[PDB]
Amino acid sequence: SGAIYVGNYRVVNRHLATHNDWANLVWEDSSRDLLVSSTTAQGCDTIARCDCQTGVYYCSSRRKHYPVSFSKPSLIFVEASEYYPARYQSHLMLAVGHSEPGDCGGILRCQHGVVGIVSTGGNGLVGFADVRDLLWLDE
Ligand SMILES: NC(=O)[C@H]1CCCN(C(=O)Cc2cccc3c2OCO3)C1
Numbered sequence: 001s002g003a004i005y006v007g008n009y010r011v012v013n014r015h016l017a018t019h020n021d022w023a024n025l026v027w028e029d030s031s032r033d034l035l036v037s038s039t040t041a042q043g044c045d046t047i048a049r050c051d052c053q054t055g056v057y058y059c060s061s062r063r064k065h066y067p068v069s070f071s072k073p074s075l076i077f078v079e080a081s082e083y084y085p086a087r088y089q090s091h092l093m094l095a096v097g098h099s100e101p102g103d104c105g106g107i108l109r110c111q112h113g114v115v116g117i118v119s120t121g122g123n124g125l126v127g128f129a130d131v132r133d134l135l136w137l138d139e
């Protein structure tokens with residue numbers, strides 16, 4: 001579990017979105033596993049606007065933060081689930097690191113701010129849904 005709170009927005013994994021998220025829906029994309037909902041309270045997370053390939057992510061299955069090198073956001077493969085069939089997820093970045101299903105929602109950050117959230121993993125890899133291209137989250 002986990003979310004990003006920036007301004008009047010909440011960014012979560014689409015497969016983990018609640019009834020409230022869908023009742024206050026701003027934008028969602030199954031291909032990116034992202035959903036953005038509106039909030040009453042103001043969020044203070046800073047979104048990074050950069051091309052960093054290094055950062056630190058929170059791993060809830062270990063109660064620890066880990067430093068990682070990660071790939072550039074690209075179209076990558078994802079096995080089915082009670083959420084989605086086999087497909088390419090777009091805007092996805094991979095790193096070598098520990099991850100378990102409940103780790104989805106953990107934030108990845110660089111020196112410039114929030115980069116993305118955990119969205120996939122397995123076999124010693126962890127995948128993050130990039131949010132740095134969503135310029136509208138700030139205005
Ligand atoms: N975005 C998707 O289509 C995902 C939806 C939930 C299932 N999924 C996973 O990757 C599950 C998983 C297994 C093992 C380590 C994991 C992990 O998730 C975080 O790290 C795919």
Ligand SMILES: [Zn+2]
Nearest residue numbers: 050052110112
């Ligand atoms: Zn950065």
